[PDB]
Design a protein around this ligand. Structure first.
Ligand SMILES: *[C@@H]1O[C@H](CO)[C@@H](O[C@@H]2O[C@H](CO)[C@@H](O[C@@H]3O[C@H](CO[C@H]4O[C@H](CO)[C@@H](O)[C@H](O)[C@@H]4O)[C@@H](O)[C@H](O[C@H]4O[C@H](CO)[C@@H](O)[C@H](O)[C@@H]4O)[C@@H]3O)[C@H](O)[C@H]2NC(C)=O)[C@H](O)[C@H]1NC(C)=O
Ligand SMILES: *[C@@H]1O[C@H](CO)[C@@H](O)[C@H](O)[C@H]1NC(C)=O
Ligand SMILES: *[C@@H]1O[C@H](CO)[C@@H](O)[C@H](O)[C@H]1NC(C)=O
Ligand SMILES: *[C@@H]1O[C@H](CO)[C@@H](O)[C@H](O)[C@H]1NC(C)=O
Lengths: 151, 155
């Protein structure tokens, strides 16, 4: 019954609570994941392919939009991500349904407020090609980590 | 009386005012934004940052002890009472851009309040002083026995 939480940790200086998200969740189990946070745009197959930086052992943050969220988490898991954060962009992108097969890693939807609070602690601008807010960033560096707790 | 202060180590500092205890940390992480969170323009506004309003007095004193000018200095940010994350007060003390001078003052404040203060702020990077009331979810278990036990309180 403990609330779901997204927190940021530096190199042992402490844990800082970003948000208690009331948004929809999928549990494989009640889980606690911790690692580098990394942006994967819409989380499509090509989005993960085009990334210039490691996804394994990392939590991915993706925008809702082009594909269904199940496909997003399937792609993230396909590239060995440990969890998925989903936030909703300012422009709403229609979902189109292509060929797809048949949730083990935690999946948490967060407010755009929490997404921007994470981004302000992240580095590297998102490509202009994504047509997303300037607050967007790609990598959580400086040995920082994000902790997602899903109960 | 006046609040009593003790620093556990370079990471965790603590204030005790009345029945309440507040964690104080200094690091390069911010979880508050001007666009979403409460800006404290005058001391009264601190009554928007804590679970119970009265305890805000402890923050008030601490602010003036740091050197905060309620007239010219940048407003500190805090999380609203209605939000369920807890209470978080940020002083932007970065050694960069427009907060540089201000930050210095605040760090000097710390040097007078916590003998043996360690400055973790790196030059040209972002830096913050964060206050979390003990017991709120935002202070986690940093106000338990394994921390406050081996800290000795004074003043
Ligand atoms: C706590 O306080 C610190 C320090 O004041 C803040 O950090 C700075 O925030 C300001 C305001 O957002 C930033 O100022 C901008 O700097 C840009 C230059 O980029 C440098 O810094 C970035 C860091 O992200 C590096 O990546 C980059 O390589 C550079 O080294 C400028 O481009 C901006 O110019 C804007 O203003 C002019 C007028 O002055 C306009 O006319 C322009 O069109 C333009 O819009 C701007 O000056 C600054 O970058 C931040 N510094 C650092 C070190 O991060 C924190 O934001 C603050 N925290 C909170 C929560 O408030
Ligand atoms: C990703 O895989 C590489 C394999 O070369 C490994 O060295 C690295 O540690 C992995 N990353 C994480 C976060 O586990
Ligand atoms: C500070 O103390 C905590 C426990 O009180 C400990 O886990 C941590 O490693 C210490 N860090 C430093 C920098 O002293
Ligand atoms: C805190 O939140 C409530 C409702 O969410 C709002 O009415 C109030 O104005 C907020 N406080 C401040 C200081 O903005």
């Amino acid at each position: 019954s403990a609330p779901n939480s997204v927190t940021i940790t530096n190199a042992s200086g402490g844990l800082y609570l970003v948000e208690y998200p009331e948004g929809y969740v999928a549990y494989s189990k009640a889980t606690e994941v911790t690692g580098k946070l990394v942006h994967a745009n819409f989380g499509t197959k090509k989005d993960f392919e085009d990334l210039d930086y490691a996804v394994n052992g990392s939590i991915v943050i993706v925008r809702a939009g082009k594909i269904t969220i199940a496909e997003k988490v399937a792609n993230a898991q396909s590239f060995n991500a440990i969890g998925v954060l989903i936030y909703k962009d300012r422009t709403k992108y229609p979902i189109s349904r292509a060929d797809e097969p048949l949730p083990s890693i935690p999946v948490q939807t967060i407010s755009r407020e929490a997404a921007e609070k994470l981004f302000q602690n992240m580095e590297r601008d998102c490509p202009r090609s994504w047509n997303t807010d300037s607050s967007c960033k790609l990598e959580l560096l400086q040995n920082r980590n994000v902790k997602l707790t899903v109960n | 009386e006046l609040p009593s202060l003790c620093m556990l180590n370079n990471s965790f500092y603590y204030m005790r005012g009345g029945v309440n205890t507040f964690l104080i940390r200094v690091s390069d992480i911010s979880v508050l934004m001007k666009e979403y969170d409460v800006s404290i323009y005058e001391p009264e506004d601190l009554g928007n940052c804590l679970n119970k309003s009265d305890s805000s007095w402890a923050i008030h004193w601490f602010s003036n002890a740091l050197g905060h000018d309620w007239l010219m200095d940048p407003p500190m940010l805090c999380r609203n009472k209605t939000k369920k994350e807890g209470s978080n007060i940020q002083f932007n003390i970065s050694k960069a851009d427009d907060a540089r001078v201000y930050g210095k003052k605040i760090r000097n404040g710390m040097r007078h309040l916590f003998r043996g203060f360690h400055d973790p702020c790196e030059e040209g990077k972002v830096c913050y002083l964060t206050i979390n009331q003990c017991g709120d979810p935002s202070s986690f278990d940093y106000c338990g026995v394994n921390h406050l036990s081996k800290c000795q309180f004074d003043h």
